PDB file of C-alpha atoms in Angstrom:
ATOM      1  CA  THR A   2      -9.015  20.212 -12.777  1.00 33.99           C
ATOM      2  CA  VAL A   3      -8.316  18.560  -9.418  1.00 33.77           C
ATOM      3  CA  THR A   4      -5.996  20.214  -6.891  1.00 30.99           C
ATOM      4  CA  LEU A   5      -4.129  19.369  -3.697  1.00 31.92           C
ATOM      5  CA  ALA A   6      -4.137  22.174  -1.132  1.00 27.36           C
ATOM      6  CA  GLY A   7      -4.487  24.482  -4.120  1.00 29.62           C
ATOM      7  CA  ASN A   8      -1.785  22.833  -6.238  1.00 28.52           C
ATOM      8  CA  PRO A   9      -3.007  21.254  -9.517  1.00 25.45           C
ATOM      9  CA  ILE A  10      -2.672  17.477  -9.968  1.00 22.01           C
ATOM     10  CA  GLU A  11      -3.322  15.232 -12.961  1.00 25.17           C
ATOM     11  CA  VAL A  12      -6.031  12.617 -12.492  1.00 26.82           C
ATOM     12  CA  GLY A  13      -6.387  10.075 -15.265  1.00 26.07           C
ATOM     13  CA  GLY A  14      -9.158   7.859 -16.532  1.00 22.73           C
ATOM     14  CA  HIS A  15     -12.872   8.324 -17.160  1.00 21.60           C
ATOM     15  CA  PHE A  16     -14.817   9.240 -14.021  1.00 22.72           C
ATOM     16  CA  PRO A  17     -18.189   7.385 -13.961  1.00 25.15           C
ATOM     17  CA  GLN A  18     -21.170   9.612 -14.782  1.00 23.78           C
ATOM     18  CA  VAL A  19     -24.835   9.286 -13.798  1.00 24.96           C
ATOM     19  CA  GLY A  20     -26.625   6.699 -15.915  1.00 31.38           C
ATOM     20  CA  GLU A  21     -23.407   4.794 -16.557  1.00 29.54           C
ATOM     21  CA  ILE A  22     -22.755   1.247 -15.378  1.00 29.30           C
ATOM     22  CA  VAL A  23     -19.694   0.409 -13.284  1.00 27.32           C
ATOM     23  CA  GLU A  24     -18.045  -2.837 -14.353  1.00 25.31           C
ATOM     24  CA  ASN A  25     -17.308  -5.574 -11.826  1.00 25.79           C
ATOM     25  CA  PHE A  26     -13.951  -5.223 -10.057  1.00 28.70           C
ATOM     26  CA  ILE A  27     -11.951  -7.214  -7.513  1.00 28.21           C
ATOM     27  CA  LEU A  28     -10.296  -5.738  -4.429  1.00 28.75           C
ATOM     28  CA  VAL A  29      -8.791  -7.112  -1.215  1.00 28.48           C
ATOM     29  CA  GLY A  30     -10.496  -7.230   2.169  1.00 27.28           C
ATOM     30  CA  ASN A  31      -8.963  -6.653   5.595  1.00 29.29           C
ATOM     31  CA  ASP A  32      -8.352 -10.398   5.846  1.00 31.74           C
ATOM     32  CA  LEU A  33      -6.392 -10.504   2.572  1.00 34.80           C
ATOM     33  CA  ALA A  34      -9.312 -12.242   0.852  1.00 34.60           C
ATOM     34  CA  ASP A  35     -10.557 -11.093  -2.552  1.00 37.45           C
ATOM     35  CA  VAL A  36     -13.728  -9.017  -2.502  1.00 34.83           C
ATOM     36  CA  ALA A  37     -15.594  -8.424  -5.762  1.00 35.87           C
ATOM     37  CA  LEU A  38     -18.109  -5.665  -6.411  1.00 33.88           C
ATOM     38  CA  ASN A  39     -20.619  -8.342  -7.416  1.00 34.88           C
ATOM     39  CA  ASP A  40     -20.165 -10.033  -4.040  1.00 36.05           C
ATOM     40  CA  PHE A  41     -22.814  -7.548  -2.930  1.00 35.09           C
ATOM     41  CA  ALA A  42     -25.403  -8.557  -5.531  1.00 34.53           C
ATOM     42  CA  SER A  43     -28.810  -6.849  -5.466  1.00 36.38           C
ATOM     43  CA  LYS A  44     -27.442  -4.239  -3.068  1.00 35.85           C
ATOM     44  CA  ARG A  45     -26.846  -0.506  -3.412  1.00 38.90           C
ATOM     45  CA  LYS A  46     -23.163   0.416  -3.219  1.00 37.91           C
ATOM     46  CA  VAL A  47     -21.409   3.568  -2.059  1.00 34.44           C
ATOM     47  CA  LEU A  48     -17.812   3.806  -3.250  1.00 33.78           C
ATOM     48  CA  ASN A  49     -16.005   6.151  -0.878  1.00 34.61           C
ATOM     49  CA  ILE A  50     -12.598   6.638  -2.516  1.00 34.60           C
ATOM     50  CA  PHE A  51      -9.671   8.144  -0.590  1.00 32.21           C
ATOM     51  CA  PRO A  52      -5.997   8.853  -1.402  1.00 31.96           C
ATOM     52  CA  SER A  53      -5.398   7.326   2.042  1.00 29.33           C
ATOM     53  CA  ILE A  54      -7.505   6.335   5.040  1.00 25.82           C
ATOM     54  CA  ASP A  55      -4.373   6.078   7.181  1.00 25.50           C
ATOM     55  CA  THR A  56      -3.703   9.831   7.435  1.00 25.04           C
ATOM     56  CA  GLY A  57      -3.536   9.508  11.203  1.00 22.16           C
ATOM     57  CA  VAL A  58      -6.017  11.868  12.812  1.00 20.55           C
ATOM     58  CA  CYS A  59      -9.346  10.361  11.963  1.00 20.46           C
ATOM     59  CA  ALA A  60     -11.870  12.582  10.290  1.00 20.69           C
ATOM     60  CA  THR A  61     -15.356  13.275  11.617  1.00 24.37           C
ATOM     61  CA  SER A  62     -17.418  14.394   8.642  1.00 26.19           C
ATOM     62  CA  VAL A  63     -15.970  11.273   7.036  1.00 22.68           C
ATOM     63  CA  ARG A  64     -17.195   8.967   9.787  1.00 22.44           C
ATOM     64  CA  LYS A  65     -20.512  10.800   9.976  1.00 19.11           C
ATOM     65  CA  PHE A  66     -21.164  10.060   6.293  1.00 18.86           C
ATOM     66  CA  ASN A  67     -20.210   6.381   6.454  1.00 21.55           C
ATOM     67  CA  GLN A  68     -22.580   5.892   9.403  1.00 19.06           C
ATOM     68  CA  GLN A  69     -25.589   7.609   7.829  1.00 17.61           C
ATOM     69  CA  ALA A  70     -24.944   5.905   4.483  1.00 17.79           C
ATOM     70  CA  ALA A  71     -24.544   2.398   5.908  1.00 16.55           C
ATOM     71  CA  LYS A  72     -27.710   2.917   7.941  1.00 14.55           C
ATOM     72  CA  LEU A  73     -29.781   3.199   4.764  1.00 14.81           C
ATOM     73  CA  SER A  74     -31.912   0.325   3.501  1.00 13.83           C
ATOM     74  CA  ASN A  75     -30.053  -2.416   1.622  1.00 14.10           C
ATOM     75  CA  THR A  76     -26.832  -0.469   1.048  1.00 12.29           C
ATOM     76  CA  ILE A  77     -23.120  -1.160   1.496  1.00 13.13           C
ATOM     77  CA  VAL A  78     -20.418   1.473   1.906  1.00 15.11           C
ATOM     78  CA  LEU A  79     -17.081   0.518   0.376  1.00 14.38           C
ATOM     79  CA  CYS A  80     -14.160   2.689   1.421  1.00 17.24           C
ATOM     80  CA  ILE A  81     -11.534   2.213  -1.248  1.00 17.67           C
ATOM     81  CA  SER A  82      -7.872   3.225  -1.175  1.00 14.25           C
ATOM     82  CA  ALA A  83      -4.429   1.944  -2.064  1.00 16.24           C
ATOM     83  CA  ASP A  84      -3.572   1.526   1.629  1.00 15.03           C
ATOM     84  CA  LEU A  85      -2.721  -2.102   2.351  1.00 17.90           C
ATOM     85  CA  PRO A  86      -5.300  -4.278   4.147  1.00 17.24           C
ATOM     86  CA  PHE A  87      -3.119  -4.030   7.258  1.00 19.17           C
ATOM     87  CA  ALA A  88      -3.600  -0.283   7.445  1.00 23.14           C
ATOM     88  CA  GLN A  89      -7.235  -0.218   6.316  1.00 24.41           C
ATOM     89  CA  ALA A  90      -8.218  -2.545   9.175  1.00 24.95           C
ATOM     90  CA  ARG A  91      -7.366   0.339  11.500  1.00 19.86           C
ATOM     91  CA  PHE A  92      -9.473   2.909   9.636  1.00 18.91           C
ATOM     92  CA  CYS A  93     -11.584   4.607  12.272  1.00 19.15           C
ATOM     93  CA  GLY A  94     -13.978   5.968   9.649  1.00 22.01           C
ATOM     94  CA  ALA A  95     -15.892   2.679   9.484  1.00 23.89           C
ATOM     95  CA  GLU A  96     -15.065   0.686  12.629  1.00 24.09           C
ATOM     96  CA  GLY A  97     -18.207  -0.161  14.574  1.00 24.82           C
ATOM     97  CA  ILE A  98     -20.137   0.356  11.346  1.00 20.48           C
ATOM     98  CA  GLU A  99     -21.764  -2.883  10.202  1.00 21.31           C
ATOM     99  CA  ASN A 100     -22.513  -2.082   6.553  1.00 23.26           C
ATOM    100  CA  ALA A 101     -19.150  -0.331   6.132  1.00 23.90           C
ATOM    101  CA  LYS A 102     -16.082  -2.161   4.823  1.00 25.98           C
ATOM    102  CA  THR A 103     -12.634  -1.139   3.618  1.00 25.26           C
ATOM    103  CA  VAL A 104     -11.095  -2.750   0.526  1.00 26.90           C
ATOM    104  CA  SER A 105      -7.613  -2.268  -0.929  1.00 24.71           C
ATOM    105  CA  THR A 106      -6.419  -1.706  -4.495  1.00 26.38           C
ATOM    106  CA  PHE A 107      -2.828  -2.725  -3.681  1.00 28.36           C
ATOM    107  CA  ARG A 108      -2.826  -5.572  -6.227  1.00 30.94           C
ATOM    108  CA  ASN A 109      -5.213  -3.928  -8.679  1.00 32.47           C
ATOM    109  CA  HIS A 110      -3.831  -0.452  -9.282  1.00 34.88           C
ATOM    110  CA  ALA A 111      -5.441  -0.799 -12.727  1.00 35.91           C
ATOM    111  CA  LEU A 112      -8.725  -0.022 -11.019  1.00 38.40           C
ATOM    112  CA  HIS A 113      -7.549   3.549 -10.314  1.00 37.03           C
ATOM    113  CA  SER A 114      -7.664   4.514 -13.996  1.00 36.60           C
ATOM    114  CA  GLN A 115     -10.796   2.437 -14.589  1.00 35.84           C
ATOM    115  CA  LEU A 116     -12.697   4.618 -12.115  1.00 35.71           C
ATOM    116  CA  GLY A 117     -11.122   7.891 -13.237  1.00 34.16           C
ATOM    117  CA  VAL A 118      -9.360   8.539  -9.920  1.00 33.38           C
ATOM    118  CA  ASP A 119      -5.755   7.770 -10.932  1.00 32.67           C
ATOM    119  CA  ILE A 120      -3.446  10.486  -9.542  1.00 33.02           C
ATOM    120  CA  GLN A 121      -0.461  10.680 -11.892  1.00 33.85           C
ATOM    121  CA  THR A 122       1.508  13.676 -10.605  1.00 33.84           C
ATOM    122  CA  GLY A 123       2.788  14.989  -7.304  1.00 35.16           C
ATOM    123  CA  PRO A 124       3.593  13.117  -4.078  1.00 33.96           C
ATOM    124  CA  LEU A 125       0.204  11.390  -4.220  1.00 34.56           C
ATOM    125  CA  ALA A 126       0.838   9.821  -7.625  1.00 38.20           C
ATOM    126  CA  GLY A 127      -0.133   6.171  -7.533  1.00 39.89           C
ATOM    127  CA  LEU A 128      -3.000   6.804  -5.122  1.00 39.37           C
ATOM    128  CA  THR A 129      -6.732   7.199  -5.743  1.00 37.66           C
ATOM    129  CA  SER A 130      -8.164  10.713  -5.968  1.00 38.06           C
ATOM    130  CA  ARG A 131     -10.945  11.645  -3.513  1.00 37.81           C
ATOM    131  CA  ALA A 132     -14.319  10.650  -4.906  1.00 32.51           C
ATOM    132  CA  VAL A 133     -17.770   9.375  -4.070  1.00 28.75           C
ATOM    133  CA  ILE A 134     -19.714   7.147  -6.434  1.00 27.71           C
ATOM    134  CA  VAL A 135     -23.195   5.811  -5.671  1.00 28.54           C
ATOM    135  CA  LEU A 136     -24.456   2.682  -7.425  1.00 30.89           C
ATOM    136  CA  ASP A 137     -27.867   1.015  -7.337  1.00 29.70           C
ATOM    137  CA  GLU A 138     -28.418  -2.724  -6.912  1.00 30.45           C
ATOM    138  CA  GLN A 139     -27.789  -3.053 -10.653  1.00 31.14           C
ATOM    139  CA  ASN A 140     -24.493  -1.137 -10.463  1.00 31.49           C
ATOM    140  CA  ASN A 141     -25.899   1.885 -12.288  1.00 36.21           C
ATOM    141  CA  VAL A 142     -24.481   5.273 -11.279  1.00 38.26           C
ATOM    142  CA  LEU A 143     -27.115   7.154  -9.285  1.00 37.47           C
ATOM    143  CA  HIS A 144     -24.610   9.862  -8.347  1.00 38.49           C
ATOM    144  CA  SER A 145     -20.874  10.587  -8.480  1.00 38.63           C
ATOM    145  CA  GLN A 146     -18.426  13.354  -7.587  1.00 41.27           C
ATOM    146  CA  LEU A 147     -14.690  13.781  -8.148  1.00 40.83           C
ATOM    147  CA  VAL A 148     -13.787  16.327  -5.475  1.00 41.66           C
ATOM    148  CA  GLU A 149     -12.039  19.322  -7.044  1.00 40.78           C
ATOM    149  CA  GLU A 150      -9.886  19.750  -3.944  1.00 40.80           C
ATOM    150  CA  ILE A 151      -8.491  16.652  -2.221  1.00 37.24           C
ATOM    151  CA  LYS A 152      -8.444  18.398   1.160  1.00 39.37           C
ATOM    152  CA  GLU A 153     -12.077  19.398   0.659  1.00 39.69           C
ATOM    153  CA  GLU A 154     -15.204  17.803   2.150  1.00 39.86           C
ATOM    154  CA  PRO A 155     -17.255  15.992  -0.550  1.00 41.81           C
ATOM    155  CA  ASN A 156     -20.901  16.869  -1.213  1.00 45.42           C
ATOM    156  CA  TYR A 157     -22.142  14.138   1.132  1.00 45.32           C
ATOM    157  CA  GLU A 158     -25.735  15.374   1.205  1.00 46.34           C
ATOM    158  CA  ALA A 159     -26.108  14.987  -2.564  1.00 44.56           C
ATOM    159  CA  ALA A 160     -24.894  11.393  -2.254  1.00 44.55           C
ATOM    160  CA  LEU A 161     -27.435  10.546   0.441  1.00 45.15           C
ATOM    161  CA  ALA A 162     -30.278  12.419  -1.267  1.00 47.39           C
ATOM    162  CA  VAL A 163     -30.121  10.000  -4.204  1.00 49.45           C
ATOM    163  CA  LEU A 164     -29.982   6.867  -2.050  1.00 45.74           C
ATOM    164  CA  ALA A 165     -33.382   7.613  -0.525  1.00 46.59           C
TER     165      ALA A 165
ATOM    166  CA  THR D   2      10.764 -22.264  -3.599  1.00 44.75           C
ATOM    167  CA  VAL D   3       9.379 -20.148  -0.741  1.00 40.60           C
ATOM    168  CA  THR D   4       6.578 -21.150   1.632  1.00 38.13           C
ATOM    169  CA  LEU D   5       4.123 -19.514   4.021  1.00 36.84           C
ATOM    170  CA  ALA D   6       3.112 -21.546   7.070  1.00 38.05           C
ATOM    171  CA  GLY D   7       3.959 -24.665   5.092  1.00 38.02           C
ATOM    172  CA  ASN D   8       1.819 -23.833   2.073  1.00 37.73           C
ATOM    173  CA  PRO D   9       4.287 -22.818  -0.684  1.00 37.31           C
ATOM    174  CA  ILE D  10       3.877 -19.445  -2.378  1.00 38.36           C
ATOM    175  CA  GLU D  11       5.111 -18.461  -5.832  1.00 36.83           C
ATOM    176  CA  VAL D  12       7.745 -15.714  -5.903  1.00 36.43           C
ATOM    177  CA  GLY D  13       8.616 -14.304  -9.309  1.00 39.60           C
ATOM    178  CA  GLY D  14      11.786 -12.660 -10.529  1.00 38.44           C
ATOM    179  CA  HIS D  15      15.495 -13.392 -10.281  1.00 37.52           C
ATOM    180  CA  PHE D  16      16.649 -13.091  -6.661  1.00 37.92           C
ATOM    181  CA  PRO D  17      20.061 -11.341  -6.476  1.00 39.13           C
ATOM    182  CA  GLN D  18      22.911 -13.742  -5.691  1.00 38.12           C
ATOM    183  CA  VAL D  19      26.439 -13.175  -4.448  1.00 37.72           C
ATOM    184  CA  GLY D  20      28.531 -12.235  -7.466  1.00 38.39           C
ATOM    185  CA  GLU D  21      25.882 -10.011  -9.070  1.00 36.28           C
ATOM    186  CA  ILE D  22      25.385  -6.242  -9.116  1.00 37.44           C
ATOM    187  CA  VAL D  23      22.055  -4.663  -8.169  1.00 36.87           C
ATOM    188  CA  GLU D  24      20.882  -1.854 -10.459  1.00 37.30           C
ATOM    189  CA  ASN D  25      19.580   1.501  -9.237  1.00 38.51           C
ATOM    190  CA  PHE D  26      15.894   1.745  -8.281  1.00 38.00           C
ATOM    191  CA  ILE D  27      13.514   4.442  -7.077  1.00 42.47           C
ATOM    192  CA  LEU D  28      11.151   4.057  -4.149  1.00 42.14           C
ATOM    193  CA  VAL D  29       9.095   6.445  -1.994  1.00 42.14           C
ATOM    194  CA  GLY D  30      10.110   7.844   1.389  1.00 43.99           C
ATOM    195  CA  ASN D  31       7.943   8.692   4.394  1.00 44.41           C
ATOM    196  CA  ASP D  32       7.489  12.275   3.157  1.00 47.26           C
ATOM    197  CA  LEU D  33       6.268  10.926  -0.197  1.00 46.16           C
ATOM    198  CA  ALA D  34       9.457  12.118  -1.898  1.00 46.67           C
ATOM    199  CA  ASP D  35      11.338   9.732  -4.192  1.00 45.94           C
ATOM    200  CA  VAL D  36      14.338   7.849  -2.824  1.00 48.19           C
ATOM    201  CA  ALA D  37      16.838   6.159  -5.140  1.00 46.95           C
ATOM    202  CA  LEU D  38      19.450   3.484  -4.489  1.00 45.49           C
ATOM    203  CA  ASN D  39      21.880   5.943  -6.097  1.00 43.96           C
ATOM    204  CA  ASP D  40      21.129   8.530  -3.409  1.00 42.13           C
ATOM    205  CA  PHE D  41      23.515   6.513  -1.257  1.00 41.80           C
ATOM    206  CA  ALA D  42      26.288   5.972  -3.795  1.00 39.56           C
ATOM    207  CA  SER D  43      29.637   4.744  -2.436  1.00 37.24           C
ATOM    208  CA  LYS D  44      28.039   3.486   0.801  1.00 34.36           C
ATOM    209  CA  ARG D  45      27.189  -0.096   1.762  1.00 31.89           C
ATOM    210  CA  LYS D  46      23.494  -0.966   1.846  1.00 32.47           C
ATOM    211  CA  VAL D  47      21.260  -3.474   3.588  1.00 33.83           C
ATOM    212  CA  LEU D  48      17.974  -4.082   1.783  1.00 33.43           C
ATOM    213  CA  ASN D  49      15.601  -5.348   4.475  1.00 36.02           C
ATOM    214  CA  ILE D  50      12.531  -6.534   2.542  1.00 39.22           C
ATOM    215  CA  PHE D  51       9.201  -7.219   4.303  1.00 40.11           C
ATOM    216  CA  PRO D  52       5.801  -8.540   3.117  1.00 44.56           C
ATOM    217  CA  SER D  53       4.536  -5.789   5.426  1.00 44.06           C
ATOM    218  CA  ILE D  54       5.964  -3.675   8.248  1.00 45.02           C
ATOM    219  CA  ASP D  55       2.443  -2.886   9.494  1.00 48.38           C
ATOM    220  CA  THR D  56       1.363  -6.323  10.742  1.00 52.71           C
ATOM    221  CA  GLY D  57       0.654  -5.080  14.259  1.00 53.97           C
ATOM    222  CA  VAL D  58       3.261  -7.456  15.649  1.00 51.40           C
ATOM    223  CA  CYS D  59       6.768  -5.978  15.742  1.00 51.45           C
ATOM    224  CA  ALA D  60       9.606  -8.122  17.128  1.00 47.71           C
ATOM    225  CA  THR D  61      12.391  -6.342  18.988  1.00 49.47           C
ATOM    226  CA  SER D  62      14.760  -8.570  16.979  1.00 52.41           C
ATOM    227  CA  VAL D  63      13.671  -6.730  13.821  1.00 51.52           C
ATOM    228  CA  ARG D  64      14.599  -3.363  15.329  1.00 49.96           C
ATOM    229  CA  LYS D  65      17.823  -4.714  16.833  1.00 45.89           C
ATOM    230  CA  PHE D  66      19.143  -5.846  13.454  1.00 46.94           C
ATOM    231  CA  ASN D  67      18.479  -2.479  11.845  1.00 49.16           C
ATOM    232  CA  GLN D  68      20.329  -0.700  14.662  1.00 50.21           C
ATOM    233  CA  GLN D  69      23.336  -3.008  14.464  1.00 48.72           C
ATOM    234  CA  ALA D  70      23.625  -2.775  10.680  1.00 48.56           C
ATOM    235  CA  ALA D  71      23.081   0.983  10.639  1.00 48.84           C
ATOM    236  CA  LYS D  72      25.800   1.490  13.261  1.00 45.99           C
ATOM    237  CA  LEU D  73      28.291  -0.206  10.953  1.00 45.08           C
ATOM    238  CA  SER D  74      30.747   1.914   8.993  1.00 42.74           C
ATOM    239  CA  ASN D  75      29.376   3.617   5.863  1.00 41.71           C
ATOM    240  CA  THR D  76      26.190   1.548   5.817  1.00 42.50           C
ATOM    241  CA  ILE D  77      22.569   2.471   5.058  1.00 41.01           C
ATOM    242  CA  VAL D  78      19.623   0.230   5.936  1.00 41.21           C
ATOM    243  CA  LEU D  79      16.655   0.359   3.575  1.00 39.04           C
ATOM    244  CA  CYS D  80      13.516  -1.303   4.873  1.00 43.08           C
ATOM    245  CA  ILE D  81      11.397  -2.066   1.833  1.00 40.18           C
ATOM    246  CA  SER D  82       7.736  -3.063   1.571  1.00 46.04           C
ATOM    247  CA  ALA D  83       4.532  -2.312  -0.355  1.00 46.87           C
ATOM    248  CA  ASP D  84       2.975  -0.581   2.695  1.00 51.45           C
ATOM    249  CA  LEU D  85       2.202   3.058   1.910  1.00 50.12           C
ATOM    250  CA  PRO D  86       4.479   5.748   3.443  1.00 52.68           C
ATOM    251  CA  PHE D  87       1.666   6.662   5.856  1.00 51.66           C
ATOM    252  CA  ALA D  88       2.003   3.234   7.423  1.00 50.70           C
ATOM    253  CA  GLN D  89       5.775   2.881   7.042  1.00 48.92           C
ATOM    254  CA  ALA D  90       6.092   5.506   9.786  1.00 47.83           C
ATOM    255  CA  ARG D  91       4.439   3.079  12.213  1.00 47.80           C
ATOM    256  CA  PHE D  92       7.313   0.629  11.894  1.00 46.44           C
ATOM    257  CA  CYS D  93       9.265  -0.165  15.074  1.00 46.08           C
ATOM    258  CA  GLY D  94      12.459  -1.129  13.274  1.00 42.09           C
ATOM    259  CA  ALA D  95      13.280   2.188  11.629  1.00 38.76           C
ATOM    260  CA  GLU D  96      11.975   5.101  13.693  1.00 40.14           C
ATOM    261  CA  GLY D  97      14.848   6.619  15.648  1.00 39.14           C
ATOM    262  CA  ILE D  98      17.707   5.037  13.697  1.00 39.18           C
ATOM    263  CA  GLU D  99      19.882   7.529  11.812  1.00 41.19           C
ATOM    264  CA  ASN D 100      20.948   5.290   8.919  1.00 38.49           C
ATOM    265  CA  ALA D 101      17.772   3.193   8.736  1.00 39.71           C
ATOM    266  CA  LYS D 102      15.024   4.407   6.404  1.00 42.46           C
ATOM    267  CA  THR D 103      11.782   2.845   5.216  1.00 43.97           C
ATOM    268  CA  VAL D 104      10.767   3.171   1.574  1.00 46.42           C
ATOM    269  CA  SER D 105       7.615   2.078  -0.243  1.00 46.63           C
ATOM    270  CA  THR D 106       7.074   0.266  -3.559  1.00 46.78           C
ATOM    271  CA  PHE D 107       3.464   1.447  -4.022  1.00 45.89           C
ATOM    272  CA  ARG D 108       4.541   3.492  -7.087  1.00 44.42           C
ATOM    273  CA  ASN D 109       7.037   0.920  -8.348  1.00 43.09           C
ATOM    274  CA  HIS D 110       5.604  -2.572  -8.289  1.00 40.65           C
ATOM    275  CA  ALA D 111       8.076  -3.515 -11.042  1.00 41.29           C
ATOM    276  CA  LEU D 112      10.767  -3.436  -8.353  1.00 43.05           C
ATOM    277  CA  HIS D 113       9.277  -6.561  -6.781  1.00 40.98           C
ATOM    278  CA  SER D 114      10.164  -8.758  -9.756  1.00 43.67           C
ATOM    279  CA  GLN D 115      13.419  -6.838 -10.268  1.00 43.31           C
ATOM    280  CA  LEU D 116      14.673  -8.061  -6.877  1.00 42.22           C
ATOM    281  CA  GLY D 117      13.032 -11.466  -7.279  1.00 43.25           C
ATOM    282  CA  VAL D 118      10.719 -10.927  -4.319  1.00 43.50           C
ATOM    283  CA  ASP D 119       7.432 -10.713  -6.242  1.00 42.98           C
ATOM    284  CA  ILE D 120       4.821 -12.896  -4.468  1.00 43.20           C
ATOM    285  CA  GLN D 121       2.163 -13.798  -7.041  1.00 43.15           C
ATOM    286  CA  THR D 122      -0.184 -16.244  -5.310  1.00 39.85           C
ATOM    287  CA  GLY D 123      -1.986 -16.696  -2.020  1.00 41.40           C
ATOM    288  CA  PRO D 124      -3.239 -13.859   0.216  1.00 40.73           C
ATOM    289  CA  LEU D 125       0.164 -12.147   0.082  1.00 41.18           C
ATOM    290  CA  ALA D 126       0.135 -11.724  -3.701  1.00 39.05           C
ATOM    291  CA  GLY D 127       1.232  -8.200  -4.544  1.00 42.04           C
ATOM    292  CA  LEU D 128       3.592  -7.958  -1.558  1.00 44.20           C
ATOM    293  CA  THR D 129       7.387  -8.432  -1.413  1.00 43.27           C
ATOM    294  CA  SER D 130       8.679 -11.712   0.012  1.00 44.34           C
ATOM    295  CA  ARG D 131      10.819 -11.574   3.181  1.00 44.77           C
ATOM    296  CA  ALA D 132      14.466 -11.099   2.251  1.00 46.59           C
ATOM    297  CA  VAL D 133      17.731  -9.491   3.220  1.00 45.38           C
ATOM    298  CA  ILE D 134      20.225  -8.293   0.612  1.00 47.53           C
ATOM    299  CA  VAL D 135      23.617  -6.846   1.550  1.00 51.10           C
ATOM    300  CA  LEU D 136      25.387  -4.688  -1.070  1.00 51.19           C
ATOM    301  CA  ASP D 137      28.910  -3.285  -1.031  1.00 53.20           C
ATOM    302  CA  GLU D 138      29.961   0.218  -2.069  1.00 50.72           C
ATOM    303  CA  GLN D 139      29.714  -0.961  -5.710  1.00 49.13           C
ATOM    304  CA  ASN D 140      26.242  -2.468  -5.324  1.00 49.50           C
ATOM    305  CA  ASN D 141      27.801  -5.885  -5.617  1.00 48.77           C
ATOM    306  CA  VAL D 142      25.909  -8.485  -3.551  1.00 53.62           C
ATOM    307  CA  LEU D 143      27.937  -9.565  -0.490  1.00 52.52           C
ATOM    308  CA  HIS D 144      25.152 -11.698   0.954  1.00 53.87           C
ATOM    309  CA  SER D 145      21.525 -12.357   0.139  1.00 51.73           C
ATOM    310  CA  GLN D 146      18.758 -14.491   1.552  1.00 51.44           C
ATOM    311  CA  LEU D 147      15.244 -15.122   0.327  1.00 52.45           C
ATOM    312  CA  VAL D 148      13.636 -16.416   3.538  1.00 52.95           C
ATOM    313  CA  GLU D 149      12.355 -19.929   2.787  1.00 51.91           C
ATOM    314  CA  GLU D 150       9.608 -19.478   5.384  1.00 50.20           C
ATOM    315  CA  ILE D 151       8.042 -16.010   5.660  1.00 48.34           C
ATOM    316  CA  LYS D 152       7.164 -16.715   9.295  1.00 48.10           C
ATOM    317  CA  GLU D 153      10.856 -17.413   9.915  1.00 46.95           C
ATOM    318  CA  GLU D 154      13.407 -14.913  11.231  1.00 45.53           C
ATOM    319  CA  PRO D 155      16.142 -14.146   8.647  1.00 46.98           C
ATOM    320  CA  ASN D 156      19.782 -15.092   9.239  1.00 49.67           C
ATOM    321  CA  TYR D 157      20.753 -11.662  10.569  1.00 52.18           C
ATOM    322  CA  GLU D 158      24.151 -12.846  11.754  1.00 52.77           C
ATOM    323  CA  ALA D 159      25.165 -13.877   8.250  1.00 50.82           C
ATOM    324  CA  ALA D 160      24.194 -10.422   6.959  1.00 51.28           C
ATOM    325  CA  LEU D 161      26.118  -8.527   9.636  1.00 52.14           C
ATOM    326  CA  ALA D 162      29.099 -10.860   9.230  1.00 49.77           C
ATOM    327  CA  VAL D 163      29.812  -9.715   5.672  1.00 48.26           C
ATOM    328  CA  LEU D 164      29.825  -6.050   6.710  1.00 47.14           C
ATOM    329  CA  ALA D 165      32.301  -6.433   9.572  1.00 47.35           C
TER     330      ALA D 165
END
């Protein structure tokens, strides 16, 4: 039921629901080093998933969210996309933001389906659908949203409301 | 055996050798549209394979080679890497060159092993090893080189030599 600029797109996999537990996964950091979800043990996690964080013009609502989220107590914001570490290191949505890091799925495309954000049709096939998943320090889903429209601003407030 | 800064890296697949024919493959162009080897049937091709074309450091020698090869009669230069199309437009060796296009493997990781450039270990696992493959109008390999040292400049002269 997800669309791109109005045009329907098929997104595969099971999108995590509240109360569910997200399994450990391994991604790649800006320095090409492996970064596992459990590397942030006993910490709340915010999975900010984007088809691409290298769209050029940086956002604003996007950066605003990352800042406010990372400023919360004992929480880490993970911006996830299939962009390679080289490109993610330039992402302006989480630059001077301490508790905000970008991690790449380039050698773990299997994760896309595992998180229910696997775009399978259209020019964006092979990329992760826009989504926001909040996890507690035990990796339990406190909140999650698979944006119906890729080019649409996620319900950021709802994501923050649960973190506090 | 290929190495990176001395430390050897494992590269899977059968690297095309002179005397072999390369089969058609489909990659993704800068506009996210599919691009196939067959789209340039009856023309010579130069497959310029890079671990990444978004390293932040772009040598003028990289751009020079593309221009020289592309200026050759009935020749198309395909710069290939796992960088997403969004980043492949930030490459200094393709932008502005008529017969020099960049294409991404993000939707076709199987192509890595197919061309024997599949890096499997180290921090570059998941990327395509540095290589240059020159094909004739029949997709027969005229020259090919799997760069023994990723940080080494390919033998561009040898590649141009077979086309003129």
